[PDB]
Nucleic acid binder design. Structure first.
Ligand SMILES: [Zn+2]
Ligand SMILES: [Zn+2]
Lengths: 142, 101, 50, 119, 209, 147, 238, 101, 117
DNA sequence: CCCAGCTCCCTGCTGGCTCCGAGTGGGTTCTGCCGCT
RNA sequence: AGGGAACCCACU
DNA sequence: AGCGGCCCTTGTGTTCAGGAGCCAGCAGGGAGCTGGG
């Protein structure tokens, strides 16, 4: 439309999810908190301008359970019950998203920090402040 | 090398001859260069092979007829005389027109 | 030829290099460097052949 | 994409309509006074342009010409009015939109001011 | 927006005169070589002010073989041409007994207008042209060899000499730019003459299909 | 780096990369990282001294082995990511002072540049005097040779 | 092709409630000079300002003037907007845009986005870049026959583009409509027809083959081109 | 007239063409076979050159037949070669350059 | 003018959007989920720097003076402390076409002065 | 004697399908099995 | 009376 | 002793040649027409 929206494609979710919805499903509702996880220096207006389209794209969903239901509905086989949808979305976010960060409960802060770091890296690439990664660089291989 | 070195040595100018021998960095850069050619061979082959097959299949039945027209298998006229001059390609030669210039 | 390339680099580092039409500055610098090195290669080749 | 441009045109027209009154309240063109020194003062070529605006612009042209004369000590006075009227008529003949007309007149004023400064 | 439009109209008129001459209609050497100044003289100079109006530019020419064969060239003022204006032109063609007409449109022609053009084909042959297509003469491009329309007798002689059926000749589409330029229809044969680097010259024939 | 060179808490295999322009330090203990040993340079001198060579010359008797070089913090394993941050001298001749120093801040030195070659290319004599595709061809043909 | 974005240094949306006094001192001075008499309806004026600053360098490079840009804005948006601009002699090139009475600020944002990319000031769409050079090889020089009867090669300027709009470029004034050509054969077929594309296909294939100095007898090329064009349309070898 | 036609066919000044019979080499062969002394006047009547070339041209047939279509197609098919033949076997060139008996 | 940041509601800490005082003709930043409101002071609700004249010196961080892979020079002493050694490098950032310009950083610890020439 | 459906035709987009050089020499493993009818 | 498929390496 | 049933591990689940170009079908829109007011 006007700007550039950031969308996360989760495992076991056949449609992309707006990133702020994922952050809220993790339990961060205030825009200030989400941006504190994504932007580490608020004196950087350019980065701030670059994230507003994502805030707008997900403006109606302002609660954790609403976002969880959103994700669960996006699931492969959504359950007609909303409770089971929320359960499935929570299971996905706790177990299938960023397992190396942690797969136990009470790991939403670590997951939020790593997801914010990913979004930050994407923003640095889009602002031309950091070079793109080379797939053939042998340091990126095992 | 140091960062942002655009000089000849850093960017792959080999200042030695094969008789003198390459330095280690020159040796590696020369290896990169040679790899490029090996790859070109190993990929161009299939691209060109497909092109050749399609050309043949598209023109395989076109031939000179006894009326000296060039026709396809459907008997459609492709050229009224082969090459527009009716000549075979093996006995022509380069010559100069003396009144043109 | 090496000293000439050094001079071109030092010129580009002081923003005294102006792009040629239809080329960004980096393309202009690469063009000049490649020209110097090609001329050197040709001159050395001619000397060897002589 | 050329169809996408058409979509934008439709949306922009819709928004204009939303911002446009149902009936165009056509403010009847003010007929110039018979004392108007403006050539073709009865013309309606340039839409949404008032004869009074032309009079004001001609007044500005008069001031510019007076400045040029006093700087260069021009002798004749009747030429001042005739020259101003001719400049205004030329500007009206050339331009086709109100804002462009005003900008052209102001540009002429700046040119005359610079010429007066030159002497 | 006025000098440019005048130049455009002059170019369209020149190309149309060349086209009419190439199709065999009678045109005087002064019309072909009419300068832009002469255009501004004969016609207006302020198309925005309605001088000239596109309705002022209509031309009517007669064939060299029979004066009864005549052709209109119309320049509709409306950028998009619909059925109504086509009916108007057909009406005046019927009134004056003119069977052929060229219509030069600005933006295009509605699909139904095209369907109408093709529907009344056998009675009235009227063809459509975008003015962008007429801003140059494509037959003067170096890539376009000389095209010549053959008469039925010539086609019969050709097929007899080479003992061919029509469907064995090479083809040209009726929608081809040069075919539209010459106004040739399905079943006609165009003779093409081009230089050759091997023979010097080479004549080929294309059947309109 | 001190701990890794002492082999106290960080095994030699561990990679530690500092991205200075960014503000990230990345430490990797994964399996599957390719690495190679390099001589450590401090100030502008090899930490490898004559005494290490003397002890290695007698490795048959005294049992002083390659592992003792690594334990004494004179050689290091560097993987590709860490190599991104290394300032590498090709030979100790690069550490010698020069009229216009090129670098003067070397952190490592190559043991010997011929170690860039694999097993088959290591039997080619004077490979630095051949066109490179020819070295590649020998690298295959040597695997086809009868012995 | 030139859009507005290629000649703008920056844009900004302010909130000017009363145009008489503006948030920018220079803007206020020049505007009030512009606001001498009621050339407008104050009621049908929005307080939202869209301020655009142009590059003197680019504007001159393309020989553009703010009058032309204002005319383009008028043509593309009409009187519903109100564009005004200062004099070119000024230190900076500026032009203010408002809307005559969705929110007006977001609407101005949408207009600015469209106006930067979709509004065309110069040139032809799809022609993204143009190069201009004097040929050194005779294959592009103009070859004439002098009155003494000799071939003579004249150096002249030719332009190479990055995209293709052959029909529009051919109709431009001062463009040679006899020699101007394209390397895109489907465009040639569309604009010039089947015999033209027959010739152009041969020339393109010859270029490819002979770029190395290699040579293939003409009858083979001619036979391929005839095979590809003999049925009245382009038959791909696929 | 041939020269004007050539100017149209090759609007660049490129005189190098591909044609069947290498006329210059044939003339050199004739000079050697018949021991032509270039430094003496020849017994070849210049009218014999004109008529000989006309007959030869009639003998070089690509499109046979006597109808007007066949005659024009034959004229076109051999046009370049006939221009070359007439400008090589000129009476003037035969008399003062090649000097054939 | 420069970029215009974003504001957060004092109550819900959500992003504040710009609204105007129709009756007063004043610019307000008003929350959209709660009902908080505020009075603006910039009056510039948007900026778009096409020319992208951004200062690379602001992005440089003084830590790069510890990078052993950067070249060092002794011919550009830093003004702030007169130390004689500096590292230099190029921008290497997209949106830098004439990016062969050098940037300098003083290598004296606790100075970290960046400059250009 | 205008208007709102209604129909018919043309565009533009997206999804789906076929194709991907010529020969030649060696090697190895795998071509089913188990519950209870 | 004599199989086949799959995969791997290699040669020009 | 031999038919059933497939084991795809997430019944829900990673890339079965990936990418490069044409054909078919659908949505969307607009021209033109016509039975009510
Ligand atoms: Zn709030
Ligand atoms: Zn300092």
């Amino acid at each position: 439309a006007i700007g550039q929206r950031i969308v996360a494609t989760l495992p076991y979710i056949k449609q992309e999810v707006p990133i702020i919805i994922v952050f809220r499903a993790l339990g961060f509702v205030s825009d200030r908190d989400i941006l504190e996880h994504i932007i580490y220096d608020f004196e950087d207006p350019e980065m701030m301008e670059m994230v507003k389209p994502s805030l707008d794209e997900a403006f109606v969903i302002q609660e954790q359970n609403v976002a969880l239901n959103f994700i669960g509905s996006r699931g492969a086989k959504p359950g007609v019950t909303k409770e089971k949808r929320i359960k499935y979305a929570k299971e996905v976010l706790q177990k299938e998203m960023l397992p190396h960060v942690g797969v136990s409960d009470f790991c939403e802060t670590k997951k939020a920090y790593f997801l914010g770091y990913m979004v930050h890296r994407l923003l640095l690439a889009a602002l031309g402040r950091r070079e793109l990664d080379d797939r053939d660089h042998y340091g990126n291989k095992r | 090398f140091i960062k942002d070195d655009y000089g000849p040595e850093s960017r792959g100018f080999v200042e030695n001859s094969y008789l003198a021998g390459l330095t280690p960095t020159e040796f590696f850069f020369h290896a990169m260069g040679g790899r490029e050619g090996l790859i070109d061979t190993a990929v161009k082959t299939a691209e060109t092979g497909y092109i050749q097959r399609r050309l043949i299949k598209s023109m395989e039945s076109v031939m000179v007829k006894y009326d000296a027209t060039v026709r396809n298998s459907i008997n459609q006229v492709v050229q009224l005389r082969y090459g527009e001059d009716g000549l075979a390609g093996e006995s022509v030669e380069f010559q100069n027109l003396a009144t043109l210039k | 030829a090496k000293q000439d390339v050094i001079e071109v680099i030092e010129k580009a580092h002081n923003n005294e290099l102006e792009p040629t039409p239809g080329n960004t500055l980096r393309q202009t610098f690469e063009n000049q460097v490649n020209r110097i090195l090609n001329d050197a290669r040709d001159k050395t080749g001619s000397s060897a052949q002589k | 994409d050329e169809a996408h441009k058409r979509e934008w045109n439709l949306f922009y027209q819709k928004q204009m309509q939303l911002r446009k009154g149902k009936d165009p309240k056509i403010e009847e063109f003010v007929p110039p006074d018979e004392n108007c020194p403006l050539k073709e003062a009865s013309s309606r070529r340039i839409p949404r342009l008032t004869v009074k605006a032309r009079e004001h612009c001609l007044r500005l042209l008069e001031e510019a010409l007076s400045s040029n004369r006093q700087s260069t000590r021009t002798a004749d006075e009747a030429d001042l009015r005739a020259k101003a009227v001719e400049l205004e008529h030329e500007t009206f003949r050339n331009a086709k939109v109100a804002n462009l007309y005003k900008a052209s007149v102001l540009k002429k004023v700046a040119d005359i001011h610079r010429a007066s400064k030159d002497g | 927006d006025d000098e440019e439009e005048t130049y455009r109209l002059w170019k369209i008129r020149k190309t149309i005169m060349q086209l009419c001459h190439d199709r065999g209609y009678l045109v005087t050497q002064d019309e072909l070589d009419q300068t832009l100044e002469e255009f501004k003289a004969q016609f207006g100079d302020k198309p925005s002010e309605g001088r000239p109006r596109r309705t002022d530019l209509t031309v009517l020419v007669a064939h060299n073989d029979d004066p009864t064969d005549q052709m209109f060239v119309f320049f509709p003022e409306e950028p998009k041409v619909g059925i109504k204006t086509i009916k108007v032109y057909c009406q005046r063609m019927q009134e004056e007994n003119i069977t052929r007409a060229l219509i030069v449109v600005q933006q295009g022609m509605t699909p139904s207008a095209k369907q109408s053009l093709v529907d009344m084909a056998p009675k009235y042959i009227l063809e459509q042209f975008l003015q962008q297509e007429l801003l140059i003469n494509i037959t003067e491009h170096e890539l376009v060899p000389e095209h010549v329309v053959m008469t039925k007798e010539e086609v019969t002689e050709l097929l007899a000499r080479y003992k061919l059926r029509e469907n064995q000749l090479p083809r040209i589409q009726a929608g081809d730019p040069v075919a539209r330029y010459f106004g040739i229809k399905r079943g006609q044969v165009v003779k093409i003459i081009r230089p050759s680097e091997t023979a010097g010259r080479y004549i080929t024939y294309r059947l309109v299909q | 780096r001190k701990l890794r060179r002492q082999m106290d808490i960080i095994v030699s295999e561990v990679s530690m990369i500092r991205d200075i322009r960014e503000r990230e330090i990345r430490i990797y203990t994964d399996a599957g990282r390719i690495c190679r040993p390099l001589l450590i340079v401090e100030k502008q001198k090899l930490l490898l001294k004559k005494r290490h060579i003397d002890q290695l010359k007698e490795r048959e008797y005294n049992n002083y082995s390659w592992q003792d070089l690594v334990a004494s913090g004179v050689v290091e394993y560097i993987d590709t990511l860490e190599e991104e941050t290394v300032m590498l001298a090709m030979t100790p001749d690069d550490l010698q002072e020069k009229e216009v120093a090129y670098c003067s801040t070397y952190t490592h030195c190559e043991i010997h540049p011929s170690m860039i070659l694999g097993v088959c290319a290591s039997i080619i004599p004077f490979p630095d005097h051949n066109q490179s595709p020819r070295n590649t061809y020998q690298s295959a043909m040597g695997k086809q040779a009868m012995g | 092709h030139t859009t507005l974005r290629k000649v703008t240094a920056n844009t900004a949306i302010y909130y000017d409630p009363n145009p008489q006094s503006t948030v920018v001192a220079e803007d206020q001075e020049w505007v009030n000079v512009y606001y001498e008499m009621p050339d407008f309806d104050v009621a049908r004026i929005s307080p939202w300002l869209l301020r655009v600053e142009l590059d003197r360098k680019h504007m001159t490079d393309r020989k553009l003037t703010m009058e032309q840009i204002a005319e383009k804005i008028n043509a593309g948006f009409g009187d519903d907007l109100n564009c005004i601009f200062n004099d070119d002699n000024a230190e900076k090139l500026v032009l203010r845009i408002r809307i005559m009475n969705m929110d007006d600020d977001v609407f101005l944002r949408c207009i600015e986005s469209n106006m930067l990319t979709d509004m065309t000031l110069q040139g032809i769409e799809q022609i993204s870049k143009v190069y201009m050079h004097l040929p050194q090889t005779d294959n592009k020089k103009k070859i004439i026959i002098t009155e003494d009867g000799e071939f003579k090669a004249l150096q002249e300027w030719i332009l190479e583009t990055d995209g293709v709009s052959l029909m529009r470029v051919l109709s431009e004034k001062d463009v040679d409509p006899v020699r101007t050509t394209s390397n895109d054969i489907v465009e040639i077929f569309t604009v010039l027809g089947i015999e033209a594309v027959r010739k152009a296909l041969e020339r393109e294939l010859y270029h490819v083959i002979s770029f190395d100095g290699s040579y293939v007898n003409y009858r083979h090329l001619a036979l391929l081109c005839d095979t590809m064009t003999c049925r009245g349309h382009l038959m791909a070898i696929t | 007239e041939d020269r004007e036609v050539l100017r149209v066919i090759f609007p660049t000044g490129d005189s190098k063409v591909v044609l069947p019979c290498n006329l210059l080499r044939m003339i050199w062969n004739a000079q050697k076979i018949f021991h032509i002394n270039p430094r003496l006047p020849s017994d070849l009547h210049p009218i014999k050159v004109v008529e000989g070339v006309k007959e030869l041209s009639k003998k070089l047939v690509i499109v046979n037949g006597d109808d007007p279509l066949s005659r024009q197609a034959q004229e076109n098919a051999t046009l370049l070669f006939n221009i070359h033949l007439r400008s090589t076997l000129c009476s003037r060139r035969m008399a003062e350059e090649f000097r054939l008996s | 003018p420069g970029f215009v940041g974003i504001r957060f509601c004092q109550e819900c800490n959500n992003m504040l959007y710009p609204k105007e005082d129709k009756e007063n003709r004043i610019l307000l930043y008003a929350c959209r989920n709660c009902d908080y409101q505020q009075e603006a002071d910039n009056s510039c609700i948007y900026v778009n720097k096409i020319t992208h004249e951004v200062d690379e010196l602001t992005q440089i961080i003084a830590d790069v003076s510890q990078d052993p892979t950067l070249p060092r020079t002794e011919d550009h002493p830093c003004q702030k402390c007169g130390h004689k050694e500096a590292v230099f490098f190029q921008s290497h950032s997209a949106r830098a076409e004439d990016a062969m310009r050098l940037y300098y950083v003083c290598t004296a610890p606790h100075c970290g002065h960046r400059w250009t020439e």
